[PDB]
């Protein structure tokens, strides 16, 4: 009975990725009314995995200078586009967001050469936490530059971005970037 | 402690070829009440009281007064 905003439950959300189950916090101790909790999750390493995923998205929305610190605006932008994901798909918006997080996180990518090197790149595996972080960052960036210089409002660009990422469609900026990174890692194997 | 354990003075001396600068710093001794120096000890100085020599009672003696 701790539905988000006041409408979205969490009891039905299934992560079903095993790898990211411990790093997406949505279900029972992480069911909160609002994606705004002050919180001190940056004080110690790995704690941000205890932060609810909706609050992580909300924090990632405050970007590009003019929107720094405006968290009430971002919680409004999440409340909308949850109201819109529900209308477009008919599913729980939390489930759509979780599926988007699963689909948009890279599994491999390239670093500078192995132990050492200054010429090419070497493929490596991605931590689950870095997977979730990169997924949130890519989803937010795709929404941000879909809404820029366009009559389409934010909370519409973000809703469609999350829906496409949940579907796995290539109309999503996050899915395109994930595929690009994974392919480059493949080439540098 | 530099603000109450060392007393500093700077002075000029007008000589034929120019000015000589003199600086004098004195580190005062610890003075308990008597003004030769500061009353407070240095903050890093720990003094441990020497334990008095006691004799462990071999047998229970009761003293009535």
């Amino acid at each position: 009975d701790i539905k988000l905003f006041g409408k979205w439950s969490t009891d039905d959300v299934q992560i079903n990725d095993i790898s990211l189950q411990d790093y997406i916090a949505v279900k029972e101790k992480y069911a909160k009314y609002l994606p705004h909790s002050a919180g001190r999750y940056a004080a110690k390493r790995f704690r941000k995995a205890q932060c609810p995923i909706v609050e992580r998205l909300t924090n990632s929305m405050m970007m590009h200078g003019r929107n720094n610190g405006k968290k009430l605006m971002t919680v409004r932008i999440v409340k909308h586009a949850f109201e819109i994901i529900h209308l477009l798909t008919g599913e729980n918006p939390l489930q759509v967001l979780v599926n988007a997080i699963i689909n948009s996180g890279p599994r491999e990518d390239s670093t500078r050469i192995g132990r050492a090197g200054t010429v090419r790149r070497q493929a490596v595996d991605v931590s689950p936490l870095r997977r979730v972080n990169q997924a949130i960052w890519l989803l937010c960036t795709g929404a941000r530059e879909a809404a820029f210089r366009n009559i389409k409002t934010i909370a519409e660009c973000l809703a469609d971005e999350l829906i496409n990422a949940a579907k796995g469609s290539s109309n999503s900026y996050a899915i395109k970037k994930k595929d690009e990174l994974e392919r480059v890692a493949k080439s540098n194997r | 402690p530099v603000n109450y354990y060392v007393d500093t003075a700077v002075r000029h001396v007008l000589l034929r070829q120019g000015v000589l600068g003199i600086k004098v710093k004195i580190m005062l001794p610890w003075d308990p009440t008597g003004k030769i120096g500061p009353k407070k000890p240095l903050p890093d100085h720990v003094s441990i009281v020497e334990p008095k020599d006691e004799i462990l009672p071999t047998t229970p003696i009761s003293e009535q007064k």
Binding site: - | K40, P41, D44, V46
Partner: protein, 132 residues
């Protein structure tokens, strides 16, 4: 970094060596003891000294410490070191002896010893580590 400075450590060592009887495993009693028996002009320094005294009390609880030297503790330590087995390890019914030391004992005039058992000597003269 919680590394204690030499001020704290030497103060704690002296306090322990002088007042070992009054101290224990309790930080909050140890700090009162320190503030009663010593003159520490700061509360934080007193707390650091008491904490290290507690740590060292725990350390001496399970043996000795290279810094401390308690006069009364050494008596009990040598009392533990005074262990004596029932039968001396040097009292053996039969002791093996090589032919060479048997000949040496015979030359000593002690060839009449009975406990000696003349064991067989080694065969191969291979007692050196190979070079390379």
């Amino acid at each position: 970094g919680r590394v204690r400075t030499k001020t704290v450590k030497k103060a704690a060592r002296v306090i322990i060596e002088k007042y070992y009887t009054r101290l224990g495993n309790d930080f909050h009693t140890n700090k009162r003891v320190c503030e009663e028996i010593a003159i520490i002009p700061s509360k934080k320094l007193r707390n650091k000294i008491a904490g290290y005294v507690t740590h060292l009390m725990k350390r001496i609880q399970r043996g000795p410490v290279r810094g401390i030297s308690i006069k009364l503790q050494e008596e009990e330590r040598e009392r533990r070191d005074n262990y004596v087995p029932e039968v001396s390890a040097l009292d053996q019914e039969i002791i093996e002896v090589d032919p060479d030391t048997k000949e040496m004992l015979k030359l000593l005039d002690f060839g009449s010893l009975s406990n000696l058992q003349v064991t067989q000597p080694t065969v191969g003269m291979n007692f050196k580590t190979p070079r390379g």
